[PDB]
């Protein structure tokens, strides 16, 4: 059962999530309109391709961790 969608500006960047070469994913995240690959683990935690080894509780937390990782840099599409 999918997490809720979200939309906010986090550290100056627009992060969005929504239920929907890489897995068939039930949830999409975007950083300034560029899709960020994210993945859910069996225990319900989430990761993203820019923070793959450090599970966080929700897709929004993964989007925020991606903005933190990027330090302002644009994301490239997968």
């Amino acid at each position: 059962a999918a997490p809720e969608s979200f939309d906010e500006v986090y550290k100056g960047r627009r992060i969005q999530g929504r239920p929907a070469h890489e897995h068939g994913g039930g949830y999409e995240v975007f950083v300034d309109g560029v899709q960020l690959h994210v993945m859910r683990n069996a225990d319900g935690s989430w990761i993203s391709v820019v923070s793959h080894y450090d599970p966080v509780p929700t897709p929004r937390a993964a989007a925020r961790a991606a903005v933190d990782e990027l330090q302002g840099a644009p994301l490239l599409p997968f």
Binding site: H23, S51, H52
Partner: protein, 277 residues
């Protein structure tokens, strides 16, 4: 054919390892390793097909992947072998690993940029091409996102686990493989990726040459586990959906099985590896 602790390499060995890595990068061969790893990282899932990690085949897959990379290095300089980083022993930013004559040190604070060593962006010799974060320079934040590397006592606690792996054969598993991988428990391999930071914390983690030394030590720990548990072996052993069973072939090679990779001594030995006691 001997894999040595990084801390013990001679100046000549460090130089030749570095120069072979830089030549694989220059010729374009290096980045395809980065790309293969990212494809499995992004595709492996806990409830679907899973081969390169979060699964029993995490260990044999990385063993073969590292063999492919070591063979490419040897195609450039046949004297070079993969060194390993015992992050339980060499656990500070002061380790010789991180010196400018080997891998260079941590990233500066502003932008995580590695400023020294042969892989610093300023050299012009280490462009980050296969990437998600759009920046093109090597980044690290040693000890940034997590305080400490695993200790010998914590590694020993994982080595003590008798079952190789357990149903459901994924990130929720109990058993040796998942505790070494780190998704459950005190956390060994995942924590090391987090501790280095920069590209090592991402799905394009072979962008950092320390990737190979980390995984060579993870591979050594599998060998130590086998010595501690000569009675325990790879599982599952047949007919498991979405998981590579013992005698099933593995992507992307398709021509090798976990069974063909359990015994490392067919391909290399270690500078030191205890006998079962």
């Amino acid at each position: 054919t001997v894999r040595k602790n990084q801390a013990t390499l001679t100046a000549d060995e460090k130089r030749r390892f570095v120069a072979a890595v830089l030549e694989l990068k220059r010729s374009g061969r290096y980045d395809e390793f980065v790309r293969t790893h990212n494809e499995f990282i992004m595709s492996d899932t806990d409830s679907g097909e899973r081969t390169g990690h979060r699964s029993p085949s995490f260990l044999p897959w990385h063993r073969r992947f590292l063999l492919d990379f070591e063979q490419a290095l040897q195609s450039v300089d046949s004297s070079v072998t993969l060194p390993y980083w015992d992050w339980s022993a060499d656990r500070t930013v002061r380790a010789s690993l991180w010196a400018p004559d080997f891998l260079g040190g941590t990233g500066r604070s502003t932008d995580g940029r590695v400023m020294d060593g042969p892989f610093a962006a300023s050299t012009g010799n280490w462009p980050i091409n296969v990437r998600v974060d759009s920046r093109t320079y090597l980044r690290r934040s040693l000890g940034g996102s997590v305080a400490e590397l695993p200790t010998r006592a914590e590694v020993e606690s994982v080595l003590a686990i008798s079952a190789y792996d357990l149903p459901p054969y994924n990130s929720a598993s109990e058993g040796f493989r998942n505790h070494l991988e780190g998704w459950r428990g005190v956390n060994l391999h995942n924590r090391v990726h987090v501790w280095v930071g920069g590209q090592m914390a991402t799905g394009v983690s072979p962008n950092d040459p320390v990737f190979w030394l980390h995984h060579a030590y993870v591979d050594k720990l599998w060998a130590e586990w086998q010595r501690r548990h000569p009675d325990s072996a790879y599982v599952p052993t047949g007919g498991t959906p979405d998981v590579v069973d013992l005698n099933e072939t593995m992507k992307p090679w398709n021509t090798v099985r976990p069974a063909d990779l359990l015994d490392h001594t067919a391909y290399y030995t270690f500078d030191a590896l205890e006998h079962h006691h």
